[PDB]
Amino acid sequence: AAAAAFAAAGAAAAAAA
Amino acid sequence: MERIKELRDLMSQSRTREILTKTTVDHMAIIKKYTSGRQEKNPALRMKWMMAMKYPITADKRIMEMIPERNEQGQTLWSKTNDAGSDRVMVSPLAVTWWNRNGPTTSTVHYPKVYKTYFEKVERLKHGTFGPVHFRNQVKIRRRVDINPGHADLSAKEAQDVIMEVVFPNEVGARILTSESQLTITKEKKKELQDCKIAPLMVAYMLERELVRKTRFLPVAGGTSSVYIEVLHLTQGTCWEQMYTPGGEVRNDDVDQSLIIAARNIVRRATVSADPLASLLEMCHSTQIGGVRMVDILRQNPTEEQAVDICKAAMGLRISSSFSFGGFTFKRTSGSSVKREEEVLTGNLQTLKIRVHEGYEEFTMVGRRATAILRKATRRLIQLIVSGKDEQSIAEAIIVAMVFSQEDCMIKAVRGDLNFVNRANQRLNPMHQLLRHFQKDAKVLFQNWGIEPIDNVMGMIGILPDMTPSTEMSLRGVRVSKMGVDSTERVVVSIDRFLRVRDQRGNVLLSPEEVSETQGTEKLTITYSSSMMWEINGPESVLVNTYQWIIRNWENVKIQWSQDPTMLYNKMEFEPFQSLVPKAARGQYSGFVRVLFQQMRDVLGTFDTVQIIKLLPFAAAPPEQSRMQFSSLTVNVRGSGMRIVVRGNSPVFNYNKATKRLTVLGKDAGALMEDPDEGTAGVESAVLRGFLILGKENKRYGPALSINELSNLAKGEKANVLIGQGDVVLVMKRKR
RNA sequence: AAGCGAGAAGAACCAGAAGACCAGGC
RNA sequence: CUCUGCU
RNA sequence: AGUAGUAACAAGAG
Ligand SMILES: *O[C@H]1[C@@H](OC)[C@H](n2cnc3c(=O)[nH]c(N)nc32)O[C@@H]1COP(=O)(O)OP(=O)(O)OP(=O)(O)OC[C@H]1O[C@@H]([n+]2cn(C)c3c(=O)[nH]c(N)nc32)[C@H](O)[C@@H]1O
């Protein structure tokens, strides 16, 4: 179903705490 | 048990007992490397010296019981002496040969599995295909490539955890494998490594090699994938290219990237053609990626890319009109935009030149764990509606949309150490760098973006910077929908002569203008199979090969330029060069160069072969009349504007008179045979449009003048002009 | 697209007046 | 008489 | 002697 063709960068985020 | 007995014996010895008791496990890392011997400064000499003594090798004490002291010829295989600084004994190479000859054999079915990487090299070289070798002016650029692709799904840390599980299950510690890929690979490896007597340390090292990705900066000319880098010595040479196709399966990501690169090069080259659609079709039917024809990979490779999409449209294949960014597939549902470069100053006081998209537009974002609908204007996020499954996915989608907006507060939200040039000072993609930085930390970005009042929008609760949902307030233009809104459809399109892709209704979906201007490197070597083999090469290769072709055909190029220059300018061999020439300055450069050529033809003598070689490629484009004066002609090379100087010698275009040899970008292009009709005689007459270069100044007609303002001269008058590398010369406005 | 050394959690963590009287606002 | 051939 | 070159080898330590 929902899929990412090509994901660059490290991803995630430190804002969530 | 042997080891506990050895421990008891060690405790029996007083000094060894004191060492064992006093030293801690932390201090072991220090006393483990405790060695009296020093690193040999010239090991080759020491080795040559030690191969002459009787017993240069050292072996474990047990050798004495498992190898006879002497062979049937009486030569002593080993001795009683104990190796210095260890319990190992001395041994001769005879012992090793004896062991390999009549030693205790064992099973080695496990070796291919533990040394999987090396035997994979052997296998894929065995099934590789060798094509013809082509002698070409190879231009190798130094760039980071991968030598060990590793297990992409597993980061270095995951690979280390899997290695600990497989090799040292008891010494794992508190770590637990979570990623499903970790569990599956750990399982298969444990099943394969059953009853493996090989040292666990070697197995761990081989697994680190196999799993952990490793990169290396290497001068390359073809594909940068590991399957091509390991055979780089065999494939790419100084003057030759060996068309080689490594055997075995190829990573789908590498083929996708190489297809994107090939499509970008083909469309960029095909734009400057007189019949772009036919030219694009020919380069598609003549190009091969990784040894596979490019014609038949598009119909089987759904990678989304405006260039790939243009190529698919040219062949009648349904396109998606989508593009990847930040791991999300964007489809432009409505709106249009035009690319234009523009300089920005980041929040960390670094100046960037980013490509801003002018124009209102609306996108649909699809991700692995998120989906969003976005509407943006020039550096302004009009609206964003996210539907992430979890808060982390929502944050990722919001950050990606934020960066994609290219908003000023986005740019100014950069904090800390963010570098947009790698250690080689190659310009990184600013958008990717910003994505990486903000995905590392986004607190500043959300704090500096702004909050918008939100009413009770049904099923569209707002989100706050702290990531907690809110109803009354939210990030400016950001809403979160719980309807799980979730494009893939491939719409048949018609592509016109100029590569403008229009759907049934007729709106321009894709055009070559929105194709990316970056000149990337293919993961798999791309081979072009037309008469001029360098159509789709990088910038430097195109420059060098264009000038080399001019040199080779110089005998006919001269006559054609003298009696029929219009057809010379038409010559397709200059089109890729023009692809490197900026679109804005193409017509003006062509007009200026054509005028210079015509004035050179009219003026008796003043023929300059080197100048014609330098300026001929710029004359391909249709002329554009103008009065502006060019001190240098610009060409795009990996995001840099290389300036070819009209008069004088510059690194981009060099003519060594001592060797009469032309070098382009430091790459030799050949020598120009002596032309008796050249007769420069100081006067050039092929530098300034409408002006003749008398030569050295004489300080009577004027002190000096600039190139641009020099147009003030009406006719006939002589004046001194500062043209070139600080060399003021006397000039005059041509009689006609 | 980037890519040049390592991590994870021992032990355990509130208060009542009530009554009378006086002054006072409404 | 033993040890060493980068200490 | 000779190697070699700004200081050494032409055995050294028990
Ligand atoms: O390695 C390259 C590229 O292939 C060479 C690779 N890549 C692209 N697509 C895939 C893929 O599907 N699968 C794999 N495995 N790899 C893929 O990633 C790299 C791409 O980046 P690069 O070529 O260096 O530059 P560029 O192509 O420009 O990337 P980027 O700058 O991140 O932009 C990507 C797309 O975004 C479009 N775009 C950005 N903005 C802000 C807008 C906009 O505001 N409006 C519109 N209409 N489009 C925008 C860019 O134009 C580009 O299309």
For B430-486, give the DSSP string: HHHHHHHHHHH--HHHHHTT-EEE----TT--EE-TTS-EESSEEETTEEE-SS---
Nucleotides of C under 7 A from a protein CB: 1-4, 6-9
Q: How far is Cα B217 from Cα B298, in angstroms, rounded to an integer?
A: 31
Contacts of residues B691-696 at CB distance under 8 Å and 24 or more positions apart, as own/partner, are B691/B721, B691/B731, B691/B732, B691/B733, B691/B734, B692/B603, B692/B731, B692/B732, B692/B734, B693/B647, B693/B723, B693/B729, B693/B730, B693/B731, B694/B718, B694/B729, B694/B730, B694/B731, B694/B732, B695/B729, B695/B730, B696/B729, B696/B730
> Largest Cα–Cα distance of chain B, in whole Å?
109
- If you write DSSP's letter for every residue of B380-432 in order, what string do you get? EEEEEEE--SSHHHHHHHHHHHHHHHT-HHHHHT--S---SB-TT-PBPPHHH
Q: How far is Cα B476 from Cα B376, in angstroms, rounded to an integer?
A: 12
Beta strands in B152-213 (DSSP E): none
Q: How far is Cα B212 from Cα B340, in angstroms, rounded to an integer?
A: 40
Question: How many Cβ atoms from other residues are within 10 Å of residue B226's Cβ?
Answer: 24
Q: Which residues of B touch A17 (CB under 8 A)?
A: 466-467
Q: Which residues of A touch B439 (CB under 8 A)?
A: 9-13
Q: How far is Cα B686 from Cα B328, in angstroms, rounded to an integer?
A: 53
Helix (H/G/I), strand (E/B), else coil: B532: coil
Determine contact, residues B537/B545, Cβ cutoff 8 Å: yes
Sheet-wide strand order for B728-733: B691-696, B728-733, B718-722
Tokens of B676: 């008796």
Best of B305, B422, B526 for a ligand 1 pocket test (most atoms within 8 Å of beta carbon):
B305
B158 CA – C6 C1', rounded, Å: 14
The DSSP H or E segment spanning B65 is helix B63-66
Determine contact, residues A4/B365, Cβ cutoff 8 Å: no
Q: How far is Cα B611 from Cα B191, in angstroms, rounded to an integer?
A: 70
A to B CB pairs, distance under 8 Å: 76
- Work out the end-to-end distance of chain A between its first and last CA atoms, rounded to an integer number of angstroms: 30
**Nearest Cα residue to B392 out of B367, B363, B416:** B367
Q: Is the CB of B47 under 7 A from strand D?
A: no
Q: Is the CB of B426 under 7 A from strand C?
A: yes
Nearest-atom number in ligand 1 for the CA of B253 is 15
Q: How far is Cα B701 from Cα B723, in angstroms, rounded to an integer?
A: 16
Strand-strand pairing, B328-335 and B338-345: unpaired
Strand-strand pairing, B478-480 and B380-386: parallel
**Nearest Cα residue to B412 out of B345, B347, B342:** B347
Are B443 and A14 in contact (CB < 8 Å)?
Answer: yes
Q: How far is Cα B314 from Cα B91, in angstroms, rounded to an integer?
A: 72
Determine contact, residues B614/B589, Cβ cutoff 8 Å: no
Tokens of B618: 């710029």
CB of B407 within 6 A of ligand 1: the answer is: no
Sheet-wide strand order for B501-502: B494-495, B501-502, B508-510
The structure's method of determination equals cryo-EM
Q: How far is Cα B694 from Cα B728, in angstroms, rounded to an integer?
A: 11
The contacts of residue B125 (CB under 8 Å, 6+ apart) are: B231, B246, B247
Q: A6 C-alpha to center of ligand 1: Å?
A: 10
Give Cα B208 distance to the centre of its chain: 25
Determine contact, residues B668/B661, Cβ cutoff 8 Å: yes
Q: Is the CB of B190 under 7 A from strand C?
A: no
CB of A9 within 6 A of ligand 1: the answer is: no
The contacts of residue B307 (CB under 8 Å, 6+ apart) are: B260, B263, B264, B266, B267, B515, B516
Tokens of B638: 């990996």
Q: List residues of chain B with CB under 8 Å from any CB of chain A.
A: 253, 256, 303-304, 324, 326-329, 366-371, 391-392, 395-396, 399, 432, 435-436, 438-443, 445-446, 465-467, 486
The nearest CA of chain B is from the CA of A17 a distance in Å of 8
Are B391 and A6 in contact (CB < 8 Å)?
Answer: no
> Residue B369 carries which side chain, given as an amino acid letter?
R
The DSSP H or E segment spanning B588 is helix B583-602
Determine contact, residues B328/A4, Cβ cutoff 8 Å: yes
Q: DSSP label at B362?
A: E
Q: Is the CB of B40 under 7 A from strand D?
A: yes
The DSSP H or E segment spanning B728 is strand B728-733
> Largest Cα–Cα distance of chain A, in whole Å?
30
The nearest CA of chain B is from the CA of A4 a distance in Å of 5
B23-52 burial by CB neighbour count: b if 16+ within 10 A, else e? eeeeeeeeeeeeeeeeeeeeeeeeeeeeee
**Nearest Cα residue to B334 out of B505, B466, B200, B202:** B505
Q: B621 C-alpha to center of ligand 1: Å?
A: 29
Are B367 and A9 in contact (CB < 8 Å)?
Answer: no
CB of B487 within 6 A of ligand 1: the answer is: no
**Nearest Cα residue to B140 out of B719, B667, B704:** B667
Q: Which residues precede a break in chain A, with C-to-N distance above 2.5 Å? A: none
**Nearest Cα residue to B350 out of B406, B420, B437:** B420
- Give just the sign of the alpha carbon dihedral B490, B494, B496, B502: negative
Q: How far is Cα B32 from Cα B451, in angstroms, rounded to an integer?
A: 59
B53 CA – E11 C1', rounded, Å: 18
Residue ranges of alpha helices (H) inside B490-582 are 539-552, 554-563, 565-570, 575-580
Q: B31 C-alpha to center of ligand 1: Å?
A: 53
Q: How far is Cα B565 from Cα B334, in angstroms, rounded to an integer?
A: 46
Q: Which residues of A touch B441 (CB under 8 A)?
A: 13-15
- Residue whose CA is at the smallest distance from ligand 1 atom 3: B257
- Give just the sign of the alpha carbon dihedral B308, B314, B317, B318: positive
The contacts of residue B146 (CB under 8 Å, 6+ apart) are: B213, B214, B215, B216, B224, B225, B226, B229
Nearest-atom number in ligand 1 for the CA of B522 is 5
Q: Which nucleotide's C1' atom has the smallest distance to the CA of A8?
A: C1
Sheet-wide strand order for B661-664: B653-656, B661-664, B667-671
B516 CA – C18 C1', rounded, Å: 89
Tokens of B479: 């809403």
Q: A11 C-alpha to center of ligand 1: Å?
A: 17
The contacts of residue B708 (CB under 8 Å, 6+ apart) are: B628, B629
CA distances to A7, B327, B464 from A4, rounded to whole Å, are: 6, 5, 26
Q: How far is Cα B342 from Cα B359, in angstroms, rounded to an integer?
A: 14
β-sheet bridge partners, residue B72: none
Q: Quick one: B343 exposed, middle or buried, by C-beta within 10 A (0-12, 13-18, 19+)?
A: exposed
**Nearest Cα residue to B647 out of B703, B689, B675:** B689
Residue ranges of alpha helices (H) inside B272-414 are 276-286, 306-314, 391-405, 408-412
Tokens of A8: 């660059």
**Nearest Cα residue to B257 out of B221, B297, B295, B229:** B297
Q: Is the CB of B80 under 7 A from strand D?
A: no
Q: How far is Cα B500 from Cα B309, in angstroms, rounded to an integer?
A: 11
Q: Which residues of B touch A11 (CB under 8 A)?
A: 327, 396, 439
Determine contact, residues B211/B191, Cβ cutoff 8 Å: no
Nearest to B395 among A9, A10, A15 (CB): A15
Are A16 and B392 in contact (CB < 8 Å)?
Answer: yes
CA angle B336, B338, B344 (to 5 degrees): 125
B606 phi and psi angles, rounded to 5 deg? 60, 20
Give Cα B556 distance to the centre of its chain: 38
Determine contact, residues B439/A9, Cβ cutoff 8 Å: yes
Q: Quick one: B569 exposed, middle or buried, by C-beta within 10 A (0-12, 13-18, 19+)?
A: buried
Determine contact, residues B231/B129, Cβ cutoff 8 Å: no
Residue ranges of alpha helices (H) inside B222-275 are 226-229, 232-235, 252-271
Mutate to test the interface with A, among B259, B396, B415, B468 (most CBs of A within 10 A): B396
Determine contact, residues B590/B621, Cβ cutoff 8 Å: yes
Q: B431 C-alpha to center of ligand 1: Å?
A: 9
Q: DSSP label at B202?
A: H
Are B441 and A15 in contact (CB < 8 Å)?
Answer: yes
Sheet-wide strand order for B380-386: B322-325, B328-335, B361-366, B371-377, B380-386, B478-480
CB of B516 within 6 A of ligand 1: the answer is: yes
Q: How far is Cα B389 from Cα B367, in angstroms, rounded to an integer?
A: 11
Q: How far is Cα B312 from Cα B145, in angstroms, rounded to an integer?
A: 29
Residue tagged 């609908």 (tokens) = B373
Residue tagged 């710029």 (tokens) = B618
Nearest to A15 among B256, B304, B442 (CB): B442
Q: B324 C-alpha to center of ligand 1: Å?
A: 6
Q: Is the CB of A4 under 7 A from strand C?
A: no
- Work out the end-to-end distance of chain B between its first and last CA atoms, rounded to an integer number of angstroms: 106
**Nearest Cα residue to B557 out of B630, B498, B484, B607:** B607
Q: Quick one: B360 exposed, middle or buried, by C-beta within 10 A (0-12, 13-18, 19+)?
A: middle
Tokens of B274: 């007189």
Tokens of B283: 């380069």
Are A9 and B253 in contact (CB < 8 Å)?
Answer: no
CA distances to B223, B286, B527, B537, B635 from B532, rounded to whole Å, are: 20, 11, 12, 11, 20
Determine contact, residues B341/B349, Cβ cutoff 8 Å: no
Q: What is the resolution of this structure in A?
A: 3.3
- Give just the sign of the alpha carbon dihedral B165, B167, B169, B173: negative
Question: How many Cβ atoms from other residues are within 10 Å of residue B567's Cβ?
Answer: 10
Question: How many Cβ atoms from other residues are within 10 Å of residue B341's Cβ?
Answer: 10
Residue tagged 């789709």 (tokens) = B536
Determine contact, residues B269/B281, Cβ cutoff 8 Å: no
Contacts of residues B340-344 at CB distance under 8 Å and 24 or more positions apart, as own/partner, are B344/B408, B344/B411
CA angle B590, B580, B519 (to 5 degrees): 170
> Residue B475 carries which side chain, given as an amino acid letter?
L
Strand-strand pairing, B57-59 and B718-722: unpaired
Q: Which residues of B touch A15 (CB under 8 A)?
A: 395, 441-443, 445-446, 465-467
